[PDB]
Ligand binder design. Structure first.
Ligand SMILES: O=c1[nH]cnc2c1ncn2[C@@H]1O[C@H](COP(=O)(O)O)[C@@H](O)[C@H]1O
Ligand SMILES: O=c1[nH]cnc2c1ncn2[C@@H]1O[C@H](COP(=O)(O)O)[C@@H](O)[C@H]1O
Lengths: 225, 225
């Protein structure tokens, strides 16, 4: 595709240039580029992937929210705001469906360092979650099953082979739980895991940046309870 | 074109939605849309035009600068950074050439309230200036003539029919002078006008937001002298 002709290492250098210039569209395009090569990504590369995708989909989800909100106070008048809301909703689904293709097509295989098999399964759950935040109907149904399947296979792996301070295991559990509350409408399952996790981490805290996740991880229990 | 089928007032409402959502690409697209209708813009509309275009071209010029800088420290190694720099340079020229089409094609006619005939001529000078910041050769030559022609016809009009507190006349002169220093390499002409203008404004200051322009207008003389 659009980067087919470019050397993998150049794609990677240009991702980094993009990041410096604050051009996440670019950065994501370059990374989709490298990924599409077929070489397994290093830890440092994967951080470029997620970071870029996250900022892109991030601003979309912002605008979506601004707009749904205006479409709430527009229920007490014109289609203009529903129309535009749908526009942004459609771009977002776009990016999600793209990132979800990378994971299904290249990144996830059932053969890898495993500490990152997680990173991907997690990423799969988050992007499927982002689709859930905007879907309706049976669409919303299936997407929910999917964020569950992934986030769960990522839990198994993270428990079995990851110490409970691993900012991966932390972040993952955090996410999976936000999903439990915000999406699947199951605050029992949500509170349990939010507690348990922050438990078994406050435990080995003796071994200092996972603490930021832990700040949030509890920060969430405030409102949940 | 892409908004041809949409009612002018809807375009305008959606610009405003865009602004709330912080989607300047959208906002600019919608406005190019309304402008393309053929109806003269009100003051409030024009502010949506400029604001949207400004933020778009604004982030481009940022990235350009980040990148040229990395391409400076890259002169003491790979084409990756020149290549990407050129990419961004080309998007920018794009947007400039678009905005410059709106002015030449719709917005500027030699028949209007005139206090805004200025607003456009000024806008023409700034976008031509933005092209100058990145051009070379005879290209750079012609573009400079063009930012001059415009900014000047905008000076005549602004002197003749505008009191020297008019945030338009202020801003204009400010810009025209930055051009004199930063682009046309003529600090004599630059210092003169920067002085003169801030003079005849400090004069009638007795008649309180143009002061922000005046803050800058002097702020510039610091470095210029
Ligand atoms: O850097 C991060 N990594 C993982 N989760 C985060 C991060 N920053 C914030 N969060 C959490 O994610 C929530 C928003 O959901 P998300 O951004 O869709 O994953 C926030 O309310 C936090 O609980
Ligand atoms: O809101 C504004 N209107 C007009 N000129 C501005 C504004 N903000 C900053 N400037 C000036 O414009 C310079 C940057 O050039 P410009 O952004 O290409 O017009 C700044 O250094 C200021 O002198």
């Amino acid at each position: 595709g659009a980067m087919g002709s470019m050397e993998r290492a150049s794609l990677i250098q240009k991702a980094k240039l993009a990041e410096q210039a604050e051009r996440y569209e670019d950065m994501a395009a370059f990374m989709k580029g490298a990924v599409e090569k077929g070489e397994e990504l290093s830890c440092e590369e994967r951080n470029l992937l997620s970071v870029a995708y996250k900022n892109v989909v991030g601003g979309q989800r912002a605008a979506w929210r601004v707009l749904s909100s205006i479409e709430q106070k527009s229920n007490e008048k014109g289609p203009e705001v529903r129309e535009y809301r749908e526009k942004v909703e459609t771009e977002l689904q776009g990016v999600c469906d793209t990132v979800l293709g990378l994971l299904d097509s290249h990144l996830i295989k059932e053969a890898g360092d495993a500490e990152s098999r997680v990173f991907y399964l997690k990423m799969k759950g988050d992007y499927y979650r982002y689709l859930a935040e905007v879907a309706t109907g049976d669409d919303k149904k299936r997407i929910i099953d999917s964020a569950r399947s992934a986030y769960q296979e990522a839990m198994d792996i993270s428990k079995k082979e990851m110490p409970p301070t691993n900012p991966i295991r932390l972040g993952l559990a955090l996410n999976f739980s936000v999903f439990h509350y915000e999406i699947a409408n199951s605050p029992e399952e949500a509170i349990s895991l939010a507690k348990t996790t922050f438990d078994e981490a406050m435990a080995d805290l003796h071994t200092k940046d996972s603490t930021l996740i832990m700040q949030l991880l509890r920060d969430n229990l405030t409102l949940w309870t």
